[PDB]
From a paper:
[name] ([name], [name], [name]) is an enzyme found in lysosomes and in the extracellular space where it catalyses the conversion of sphingomyelin, a major component of membranes, into ceramide and phosphocholine. [name] consists of an N-terminal saposin domain and a C-terminal catalytic domain. To gain insight into the molecular mechanism of [name] function and the interplay between its domains, we determined crystal structures of the full-length protein from mouse that reveal a conformational flexibility of the saposin domain. In one conformation, the saposin domain adopts a globular closed form independent of the catalytic domain, while in the other conformation, it assumes an open V-shaped fold that establishes an extended interface with the catalytic domain.
As observed with other saposins, ASMasesap adopts either a closed or open conformation depending on environmental conditions. By contrast, the open form of ASMasesap assumes a V-shaped conformation with its hydrophobic core exposed and its position shifted on ASMasecat such that one face of helix α3 forms an extensive 1,318 Å2, hydrophobic interface with ASMasecat. The interface presumably stabilizes the open conformation of ASMasesap, allowing it to dock onto membrane surfaces, and possibly deliver lipids to the active site. The location on open ASMasesap responsible for membrane lipid docking under physiological conditions likely includes its hydrophobic surface, which in the crystal is buried by a symmetry-related saposin domain reminiscent of the ‘handshake' clasp observed in saposin B dimers. Indeed, crystallization in the presence of lipids rearranges the saposin dimer and reveals lipid molecules bound within it. In addition, the top edge of helix α2, which is lined with a ridge of positively charged residues, is appropriate for interaction with anionic intra-lysosomal vesicles. In the presence of anionic membranes, open ASMasesap becomes prevalent, docks onto the membrane surface and concomitantly forms an interface with the catalytic domain activating it for sphingomyelin hydrolysis.
Residue numbers in the entry: 84 to 610
């Protein structure tokens, strides 16, 4: 009734009053008070952190949740406004009828094989310090500010520590030198997450220092080998905050996207840098017959608060994705996709609109590779209508960082080699680790070793989805087999707590949940 305008007026005033930071500072003070009461982190971390966020978090709030149109529609109904914050949305596919489903034929004898190294979640802590308390109250330890191990306890290890601690640069430098046996590689995929988890005290200069430093360190050791990286979530500041392109000004993400451009011009062509400076994604031809696609999965992130304003296909990334897939289908080209956050962890509507595009172009896809989870995992795609036929699989390589309680490690994919008629699909992959227990030991030397090989330990005929599909339900029945998977799940450093059946099924359910908030995919695991 007459309350409808009063709503629109009040929200307008508060939004204006939030232009003035002193009130925002008060509003910020409250968020801190909550931070301590909820024990997200020690108070030292709260104050620093909140001060970073309040400015931008309040901006989106004024532009979205507390916008008069949106808010009034919620309290009073459609009569007075419209509430659409995380409303659902759809993507339109082309008018081309999908060709009959078709799987790749296995490679012929003597066919060349390509090696592709996969690096993700390096997470460099430039403040990392040996001897400091690994058990500190702060969300990140083993550094300056962590203090020192109380009561004659062992401090942070020299190369790293099995705890909430990221890596020292020397351990990262060590990784690059020990790729001899893992190589030679034809190209590399790098799905971001370079900074550490010390978000409560990260200036843009701190962020870009890691970008440049780490980028130069890679290009140096790799040399002529092209590296194709993707955007991670820890790479901007504030973390997870990735304003879509329609946002402009100093609060835009231009500083980051343009900084990446300079650092990566040697690796990428012109048309890819064009789109990268805009939305943090790109595509290009790495070799004849293949088309690589790097996605800015921060436009699917629940954490991206900028999506409150408009969560509907930010940057038109999905529509841009379809353009490329259809083009490759016309050419007959295959496709690999890399991104940081895997689709199973995206926003619901985003994830579903993605699932369907996979289903449509199952024949075009030759690979999907992701990270962010820091553990060794995968996710299988099925036909949309029935979720019965597996049609694609994504690989969730484990992180390089120890964060948390992990052995460092990276991933290497053996794929169909560079030759005409290549399917460009994965044939096998290998995982290498660093056994810190032995490296940080007295008189110990860093030694990278192959933890295992895929088809070897799991005895698979191929790396196609069906093989993995069978693999999942197999482990549901056999206990000892999962205990092995559990071991490799943690890069050779599993937890102490045994994984009970509920832990097991939870883990296994995730392997099928390539789509968010859909219990039907875990129907077969428990009746
Ligand atoms: C990384 O290196 C560490 C080195 O400590 C490995 O942990 C060690 O693994 C050995 C055998 O795998 C185990 O030690 C056992 O000790 C018993 C008696 O305590 C002895 O009878 C056995 O012959 C064996 O030596 C134990 O799990 C562990 N040792 C210690 C001192 O912690 C770890 O397995 C390595 N990780 C990888 C992925 O290779
Ligand atoms: C919310 O956003 C979607 C698309 O994201 C952005 O929205 C536009 C405002 C613009 O910034 C685009 O460049 C971005 O992609 C909007 O839906 C799209 O709207 C455009 C028209 O601008 C249209 O061409 C597309 O077909 C639409 N696609 C979809 C999936 O909706 C939507 O209108 C935005 N809502 C508001 C209130 O701005
Ligand atoms: C009545 C509706 C119930 C739910 C409302 C919840 C919103 C709370 C957010 C308040 C943030 C504090 C900012 C105060 C800014 C004051 C500006 C006054 P001025 O423009 O005259 O200077
Ligand atoms: Cl140190
Ligand atoms: Cl079928
Ligand atoms: Zn990470
Ligand atoms: Zn991440």
């Amino acid at each position: 009734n007459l309350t409808c305008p009063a709503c629109k007026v009040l929200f307008t005033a508060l939004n204006h009053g939030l232009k003035k930071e002193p009130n925002v500072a008060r509003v910020g003070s409250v968020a801190i008070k909550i931070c301590k009461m909820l024990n997200i982190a020690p108070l030292d971390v709260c104050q620093s952190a909140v001060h970073l966020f309040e400015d931008d978090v309040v901006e989106v709030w004024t532009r979205s949740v507390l916008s008069p149109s949106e808010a009034c529609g919620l309290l009073l109904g459609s009569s007075c406004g419209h509430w659409d914050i995380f409303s659902t949305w759809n993507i339109s596919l082309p008018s081309v009828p999908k060709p009959p489903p078709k799987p790749p034929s296995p490679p012929a004898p003597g066919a060349p094989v390509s090696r592709v190294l996969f690096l993700t979640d390096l997470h460099w802590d430039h403040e990392y310090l040996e001897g400091t308390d690994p058990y500190c109250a702060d969300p990140l330890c083993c550094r300056r500010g962590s203090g020192w191990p109380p009561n004659s306890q062992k401090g942070a290890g020299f190369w790293g520590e099995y705890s909430k601690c990221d890596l020292p640069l020397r351990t990262l430098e060590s990784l690059l030198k020990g790729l001899g046996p893992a190589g030679p590689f034809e190209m590399v995929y790098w799905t971001g997450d370079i900074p550490a988890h010390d978000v409560w005290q990260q200036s843009r200069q701190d962020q870009l220092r890691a970008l440049t430093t780490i980028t130069d360190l890679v290009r140096k050791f790799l040399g002529p080998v092209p590296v194709y990286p993707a955007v991670g979530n820890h790479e901007s500041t504030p973390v997870n905050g990735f304003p879509p392109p329609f946002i402009k000004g100093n609060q835009s993400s231009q500083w980051l996207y343009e900084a990446m451009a300079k650092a990566w011009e040697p690796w990428l062509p012109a048309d890819a840098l064009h789109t990268l400076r805009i939305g943090g994604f790109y595509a290009l031809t790495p070799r004849p017959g293949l088309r690589l696609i790097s996605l800015n999965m921060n436009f699917c992130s629940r954490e991206n608060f900028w999506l409150l304003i408009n969560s509907t296909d930010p940057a038109g990334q999905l529509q841009w994705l379809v353009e490329e897939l259809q083009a490759a289908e016309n050419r007959g080209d295959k496709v690999h996709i890399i991104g940081h956050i895997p689709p199973g962890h995206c926003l619901k509507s985003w994830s579903w609109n993605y699932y369907k595009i996979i289903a449509r172009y199952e024949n075009t896809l030759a690979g999907q590779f992701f990270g962010h989870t820091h553990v060794d995992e995968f996710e299988i795609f099925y036909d949309e209508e029935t979720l019965s036929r597996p049609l694609a699989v994504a690989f969730l390589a484990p992180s390089a960082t120890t964060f948390i309680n992990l052995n460092p490690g990276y991933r290497v994919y053996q794929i169909d080699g560079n030759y005409p008629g290549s399917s460009h699909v994965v044939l096998d992959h290998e995982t290498y680790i660093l056994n810190l227990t032995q490296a940080n030991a007295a008189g110990g030397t860093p030694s990278w070793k192959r933890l295992y090989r895929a088809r070897e330990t799991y005895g698979l005929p191929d790396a196609m989805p069906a093989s993995w599909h069978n693999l999942v339900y197999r482990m549901r029945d056999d206990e000892q087999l999962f205990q092995t998977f559990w071991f490799l799940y943690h890069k050779g450093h599993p937890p102490s707590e045994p994984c009970g059946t509920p832990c097991r099924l939870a883990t296994l359910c995730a392997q099928l949940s390539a789509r968010a908030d859909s219990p039907a995919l875990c129907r077969h695991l428990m009746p």
